[PDB]
Enzyme design. Structure first.
Site, mmCIF file in Angstrom:
data_model
loop_
_atom_site.group_PDB
_atom_site.id
_atom_site.type_symbol
_atom_site.label_atom_id
_atom_site.label_comp_id
_atom_site.label_asym_id
_atom_site.label_seq_id
_atom_site.Cartn_x
_atom_site.Cartn_y
_atom_site.Cartn_z
ATOM 1 N N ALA A 125 -31.379 96.834 17.037
ATOM 2 C CA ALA A 125 -30.086 96.217 16.854
ATOM 3 C C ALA A 125 -29.084 97.097 16.124
ATOM 4 C CB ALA A 125 -30.229 94.874 16.165
ATOM 5 N N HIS A 169 -26.004 99.194 17.888
ATOM 6 C CA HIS A 169 -24.702 98.660 18.245
ATOM 7 C C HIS A 169 -23.772 98.692 17.076
ATOM 8 C CE1 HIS A 169 -27.368 97.465 21.350
ATOM 9 N NE2 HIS A 169 -27.943 96.535 20.604
ATOM 10 N N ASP A 219 -23.904 109.023 12.519
ATOM 11 C CA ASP A 219 -23.578 110.258 11.782
ATOM 12 C C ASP A 219 -24.828 111.090 11.450
ATOM 13 O OD1 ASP A 219 -20.874 109.821 11.949
ATOM 14 O OD2 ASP A 219 -20.585 109.237 9.851
ATOM 15 N N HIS A 227 -34.396 102.522 24.811
ATOM 16 C CA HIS A 227 -34.419 101.057 24.727
ATOM 17 C C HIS A 227 -35.389 100.460 25.738
ATOM 18 C CE1 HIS A 227 -30.841 101.188 22.182
ATOM 19 N NE2 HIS A 227 -30.355 102.061 23.047
ATOM 20 N N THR A 257 -35.276 97.328 26.772
ATOM 21 C CA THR A 257 -34.499 96.518 27.708
ATOM 22 C C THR A 257 -33.235 97.256 28.162
ATOM 23 O OG1 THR A 257 -33.155 95.510 26.015
ATOM 24 C CG2 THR A 257 -35.298 94.561 26.411
ATOM 25 N N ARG A 299 -24.113 93.995 22.629
ATOM 26 C CA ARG A 299 -25.233 94.953 22.782
ATOM 27 C C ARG A 299 -24.948 96.117 23.736
ATOM 28 N NH1 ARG A 299 -30.147 92.876 20.481
ATOM 29 N NH2 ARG A 299 -29.968 90.647 20.176
HETATM 30 C C1 LIG Z 1 -22.532 115.402 11.302
HETATM 31 C C2 LIG Z 1 -22.152 115.104 9.840
HETATM 32 C C3 LIG Z 1 -22.317 116.074 8.839
HETATM 33 C C4 LIG Z 1 -21.956 115.796 7.517
HETATM 34 C C5 LIG Z 1 -21.440 114.535 7.209
HETATM 35 S S1 LIG Z 1 -20.926 113.866 5.777
HETATM 36 C C6 LIG Z 1 -20.483 112.384 6.399
HETATM 37 C C7 LIG Z 1 -19.952 111.358 5.635
HETATM 38 O O1 LIG Z 1 -19.549 110.141 6.249
HETATM 39 C C8 LIG Z 1 -18.199 109.896 6.244
HETATM 40 C C9 LIG Z 1 -17.364 110.201 5.149
HETATM 41 C C10 LIG Z 1 -15.998 109.882 5.124
HETATM 42 O O2 LIG Z 1 -15.831 108.791 4.222
HETATM 43 C C11 LIG Z 1 -15.139 111.000 4.589
HETATM 44 O O3 LIG Z 1 -14.185 111.362 5.312
HETATM 45 O O4 LIG Z 1 -15.393 111.409 3.427
HETATM 46 C C12 LIG Z 1 -15.414 109.418 6.464
HETATM 47 C C13 LIG Z 1 -16.403 108.474 7.176
HETATM 48 O O5 LIG Z 1 -15.830 107.953 8.366
HETATM 49 C C14 LIG Z 1 -17.629 109.272 7.531
HETATM 50 O O6 LIG Z 1 -18.565 108.432 8.184
HETATM 51 C C15 LIG Z 1 -20.731 112.368 7.709
HETATM 52 C C16 LIG Z 1 -21.256 113.529 8.190
HETATM 53 C C17 LIG Z 1 -21.621 113.852 9.507
#
Ligand SMILES: Cc1ccc2sc(COC3=C[C@@](O)(C(=O)O)C[C@@H](O)[C@@H]3O)cc2c1
Ligand SMILES: Cc1ccc2sc(COC3=C[C@@](O)(C(=O)O)C[C@@H](O)[C@@H]3O)cc2c1
Ligand SMILES: Cc1ccc2sc(COC3=C[C@@](O)(C(=O)O)C[C@@H](O)[C@@H]3O)cc2c1
Ligand SMILES: Cc1ccc2sc(COC3=C[C@@](O)(C(=O)O)C[C@@H](O)[C@@H]3O)cc2c1
Ligand SMILES: Cc1ccc2sc(COC3=C[C@@](O)(C(=O)O)C[C@@H](O)[C@@H]3O)cc2c1
Ligand SMILES: Cc1ccc2sc(COC3=C[C@@](O)(C(=O)O)C[C@@H](O)[C@@H]3O)cc2c1
Ligand SMILES: Cc1ccc2sc(COC3=C[C@@](O)(C(=O)O)C[C@@H](O)[C@@H]3O)cc2c1
Ligand SMILES: Cc1ccc2sc(COC3=C[C@@](O)(C(=O)O)C[C@@H](O)[C@@H]3O)cc2c1
Lengths: 153, 153, 153, 153, 153, 153, 153, 153, 153, 153, 153, 153
Positions: A79, A82, A89, A102, A104, A113
């Site tokens: 889940a 989604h 990230d 998945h 399904t 979904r």
């Molecule tokens: C591949 C990759 C490599 C290093 C990092 S660090 C990170 C942090 O997540 C986020 C931070 C923010 O708060 C920011 O701009 O400081 C924006 C937010 O949308 C993002 O998910 C996301 C990320 C992704």
């Protein structure tokens, strides 16, 4: 050649209740099917299996794969697929092949979904083949790795 | 054991231009890779390949599979995946396994490409593995057919 | 120097019924107006005209221009402008200038006509000038080609 | 025979910075290209050029054309195309031909740029041909005016 | 080292009415606070302040900064932040650091205030800190400029 | 007792063209009708009339009413009603009664005209009564002012 | 008195599979039922039947009815009803009565099936009555034609 | 000269509870205020008042006005304004002036209250003036009728 | 064999005003047309006609049909079609054939009229055939009933 | 005077991979930069740093700050900003200043990243300044605290 | 101590048909169950039961409770829950506890049933417990009233 | 007979701050109130209480109830109600009654709180009764269990 298999929330409940949609096979049984496939093809692969209900544990594990001798990840985020931008990230920063599976066909279910944040971050997505989907992921993973190292040389 | 492979609009232009997103491999080369996979696994499968830019021809071909000794369909509807309720209906009435394949990860592209009407009508969907995706479809197809006939006995 | 003029669905019905919105001029008359413009300017251009009601034929024709000595395309995809991702993709892979024409101002009609998938894939779009729009397309095509070959030297 | 050319916000910054998307040609250079086109065709046209960053000045100018011996307007409302109902209304009350031009193909950019309020109020719209688009506007304007006065007699 | 401070519509009415949401401080008082910050840190900065209720004047001023010895812009576009693609474009062509400031947290207000066209075009955005936000913008501006010139050498 | 009447973009073009939707009456004629109403009722009211096509001028004028002996505002923001958060803010900070008037019933037109930012900021809104709407605004204004000063004592 | 009956994609698969939703009757059987109705009422009508899976063939056929002694069209566009602006346009230019039929109640199915572009272009729409709906269309066609020719005299 | 005043659901509860938003004045008091206005202006008008909580009674009454010597309707449909297409239709067929009144400014409330189906069917709408709005409706009604009969002669 | 014909709000106003969209025929005349059809076909049917402007009355009547010797319902819910979940529920619990009829093609009108809650609950829907639509509903009803009782035996 | 710095998911992966969007600086380096700023300004502040990939841990930590001698929170919730109502609630109940920081300008990224639930719950938000944003948060925090305690006295 | 129980449209049809979703228990049986609960607990409560299919009767009854010795209302507005702003308003002016009950879990049904206007206006809402839900409402009502009068003293 | 009471994020902060919306009662006090209700009714129930801020702990606990002698679950998922498909899935596989409680009426709050994924997966949902809601859940749970075991025999 180590492949990390990550199983998201509720997948540990598989089969035990026979709850119709997902089937009769247990999570352990899916994992045995994977080993079987690895032997029956003589593929050069040691699997580590991991199941959790915590978004944070999925991210932790993806991260712990980075420094290590883990070559690729096969993941069914359940889940969280989604909803979880955070796992998405983590997948983007894994710097190694991630394949989303998945059981399904998530295209053919509720609107909520159809979207998969995590799947968009993966190289590829496999859906709707039951447990077999995991072996398909193994086949592809092995080929993806083969092709990554072929090029090296 | 006959599998029909249907290739939707524009896929015949693959590789010839090296147009970045889809790759360097031609459609013929994808079909050779499939034969190769069929032999190297001794799978009991004769492939018929078909490519068209007509929605109507895709529907015609799915329909012509119905009466015949065609066991299953592997299909990449291309841009029609997102738009063609008609092909989706044809797939639903094929009364045999249909597997949808995409070279690219359609989850990770424009909004208008994330929806797959046709994919929702298929048993399963494979995306984002380049040409390898087709072999994955083959593996799955053989297994799905194996399991359908196992149960017969 | 060959220009391919592609006319989409229903455009062959022009003028014959005088059906108000689109006008009194027939498709043949539009094509004569184009030749006339080519001579009266001594432009070095041979036109091939093609009209179809089939999405698949438009794609086929765009594709058949690729290998050939066709320098550019002028196209009015008609109602397919709004719906056809497939023609849009074909236009993107044509690797030569494509200009989209519309008789009517599609900005000023129903919501479902404001979007043009195909138009986004073209270098430029002309709308709302009646048959004149096609000569404007000719003018622009000649200039775009002039400028492409100027830079070569 | 007077044509009013109205240039919306930011268009005076053209070329000076070579800021990639819009090109290398300055607004003055665009206007010279227009005069050149007028002479090299012996067209019977005096151009008045006007550039502003004020929505209100565009409206003022459209209005000031009403009582006068201005025969038509060529206008690139710039970013106001997408937002300005007010300029759209002004165009509708101009009671003379208005043609909208855009350097870039606004179909092929962000969602917020696809809509053109002003363009819907114009007889026709030209997009995506760089400075050339303005000469295409001149050609069309001359024809539209020719045809308006032909019918008078 | 010149910084241009642009204040959008209605900001000149600040404080005079004590109208609750925005506070008790006047716009002049915000500007004094900025000078005070510049002296109390010995920062090498001369400020030019500008306030307008015209979208067009904001664009004019951004443009007039281009040719000049203006190093950067701090801007609070006020209600135009949400609506003005035109100012957003002007910011994109300024080719120098632009920082957007908001007294109030525009994330926490009506839906129509959450979008900032202008803010997306800026390097960075500061919201919700009352007049203090401007000094924060100064701090950041001085650092961004320091870092731009550091790299030069 | 001074009432400011503000007339937004394009309203100065009223009647002169008889352009169907808005009518035959000119803006001056609307203002004469207002004076006439003020005399024929012996109401204690001096009117200042102002018309502009600039958003910025409407805001300026609302602001210039603040310090002054202007008791209230009657306003028809025209096309800005639907778009101008800025004018809406100006109205909210006017600290005196503002009444919005529309000639036409903006409920019964295109979707993009139903929303009135400015109208939501006003005490009250009158639409669809042609020029008569302005007199209705006057009546209401006089009553609203009567009742404000009644309560004072 | 000739009526053209057009059957859209997939309708030729009717009944042969008994695929639940649409029923047990074949397309030929629907056409026999229509002839039977024509005889059992002594209606003065010769039917031409046509079924296709091509959008383009539907448009072709609608167009080929224009010049001919075809008095009206009964059409079930099938899945194209929801997607095909092109067929909708063809219907609008047919300049003769067109009646849309659906076996199933398209109001009561998926969201993507509720819209009918084609149905909006038709004089009338019949849905949800199984094959009987076609005879209803015949009844209505005969009445509409009777009433068209009555008025002639 | 008879005017029908229709008061929709819940308006009879006015003032009795002093429930903040709508005020202190009762429905009877609003109606007395109306009579007062009619006398204090010597207007030639007999009012019939009607309040109901039934959508169907509002429609019934609008209909019963058709055959009769009712010259116009002043209506506050209350919560039905936003929802009732049926009352909207009844208003469109009344063939006599209908004016819609709201105590509160429905532009400035919840999203679900901004739409008024009924108001789009009326000639004009008055909102946000408390009970005074009803006298404004009377003024306008008298003028609307005066102008209808002036033209007669 | 009793059929209940239910006519929703405003339908009783039909024809009397000749109000363009719906036509010239009165509701009584529609009912006479129905009787005439019943005789001219010797169909074994007694009709009960009912018209109301109350949602509650439509529901009551649907409910009163349940215990009785009413075999089927033909209903035109009018404006309630779009809004009334309650009637839709009543139709679902009627446990007998309900057919929805509309004079006008509700697909081809405003967006708010395309949805029919009630039509989704009916077995079938007929729109856009004027009064003739009711006879079509009779034909279908007679056939649906014939087929229900044929199966019985 | 204790400030709690909370770093959400994935931020611990910063810099180590140099993954383009977020930069080259590691999370430790960001924290060192913060200490450095605290010393170089002689600010009276002890920092506690905390990073987690668990939504639950962020909430726990916010909660543990409540009873303690923690004066304020600086938080970058990372991907949770967009999704986490739960953290947003925790922030609202912290009863102390919370400042949200983002390295990147979340206005200028995917649609799913523009919303910040958590940012709406904070007093203020800083985005798009890289690590510098954290020092800006420190400056503001120190000022917000200074001003809270000034008022006390 | 009087509680008014209001039952919305269609609830009187409960059980009689056994129509699956809602159950086997009749409305009378639900009311007996309520009396039984009142005796078996010796609660000091006289119930008045009311069922209607009319929106206006629900509002009438809520209103008639205002002046009276009715202490509270338990209401199941049925399908009106989703649509009726009018009943929602009535509930808000009832100035006494209102509790909304639903037999079925309206969260778990069609999208158009998830919204409850009326439920938002109630103190609390109970869904998905079949007839038992009403007794739960009784329990809560008695507690809410006990607590209101406890505080009085 | 064991009931598991699960309390979602932030609920442990109840009452301690008196933070207005949720009240004055602590979570411990809510649990005491539940015991009290269990004794004062002599109900045969042992309660296990669990509070967490982790989505994964909620799922873990729902899962750990499966194998055990836990008869039912009462759950308030807090802010996770709106977002957590994962908990919703866990609830669906619990194969034992689950009842969702909310202190506040989530219908009557922000749009983002109206949806309850988790609530849709529960048998029933109780909202807006403060702590009393939990006892109502107890009452219902005991009845639901009584009725499940009654049927067994
Ligand atoms: C591949 C990759 C490599 C290093 C990092 S660090 C990170 C942090 O997540 C986020 C931070 C923010 O708060 C920011 O701009 O400081 C924006 C937010 O949308 C993002 O998910 C996301 C990320 C992704
Ligand atoms: C210039 C160009 C050059 C070669 C090709 S091949 C092609 C196929 O269309 C599509 C195929 C997919 O199914 C896939 O990834 O396999 C994705 C689908 O979105 C796309 O329309 C589009 C395309 C465009
Ligand atoms: C009655 C009133 C009294 C004083 C002021 S100051 C002002 C500025 O306009 C705006 C400024 C923002 O940039 C900000 O938060 O600083 C937000 C923007 O949405 C708002 O329109 C609007 C306004 C309105
Ligand atoms: C060709 C033409 C000729 C005359 C005029 S006057 C005018 C004013 O703009 C508007 C006024 C309204 O406020 C109103 O009805 O009073 C409605 C608003 O939607 C419109 O922009 C628009 C317009 C357009
Ligand atoms: C597996 C299957 C088996 C038989 C048939 S027949 C058919 C026709 O396509 C459609 C026809 C409709 O016009 C109708 O209701 O008559 C509705 C349309 O949405 C549908 O696609 C679709 C279909 C699908
Ligand atoms: C001024 C006017 C004059 C006469 C009439 S009759 C009428 C009926 O209401 C409706 C009936 C429809 O069901 C139909 O097409 O039969 C369509 C429905 O949308 C419309 O509300 C609406 C209406 C409006
Ligand atoms: C075919 C059919 C047969 C019997 C009944 S009884 C009924 C009641 O109306 C409703 C009541 C609810 O409030 C509830 O769940 O108690 C839900 C509401 O959406 C529904 O309309 C609807 C209905 C529908
Ligand atoms: C500042 C603040 C202070 C204390 C508390 S306790 C709390 C609980 O979370 C929630 C519980 C609900 O399930 C309920 O109404 O019982 C509603 C849910 O939306 C909310 O997040 C939210 C919250 C927020």
């Amino acid at each position: 050649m180590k492949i990390l298999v990550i199983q998201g929330p509720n997948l540990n409940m598989l089969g035990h209740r026979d709850p119709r949609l997902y089937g009769m096979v247990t999570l352990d049984q899916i994992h045995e099917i994977m080993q079987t496939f690895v032997k029956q093809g003589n593929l050069d692969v040691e699997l580590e299996f991991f199941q959790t209900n915590f978004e944070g544990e999925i991210i932790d594990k993806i991260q712990e794969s980075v420094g290590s001798d883990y070559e690729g990840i096969i993941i069914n985020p359940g889940a969280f697929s989604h909803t979880s931008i955070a796992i998405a990230d983590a997948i983007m920063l894994a710097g190694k092949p991630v394949i989303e599976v998945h059981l399904t066909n998530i295209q053919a279910r509720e609107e909520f979904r159809k979207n998969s944040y995590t799947g968009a971050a993966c190289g590829g997505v496999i859906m709707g083949f039951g447990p077999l989907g995991y072996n398909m992921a193994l086949m592809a993973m092995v080929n993806i790795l083969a092709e990554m190292k072929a090029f090296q040389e």
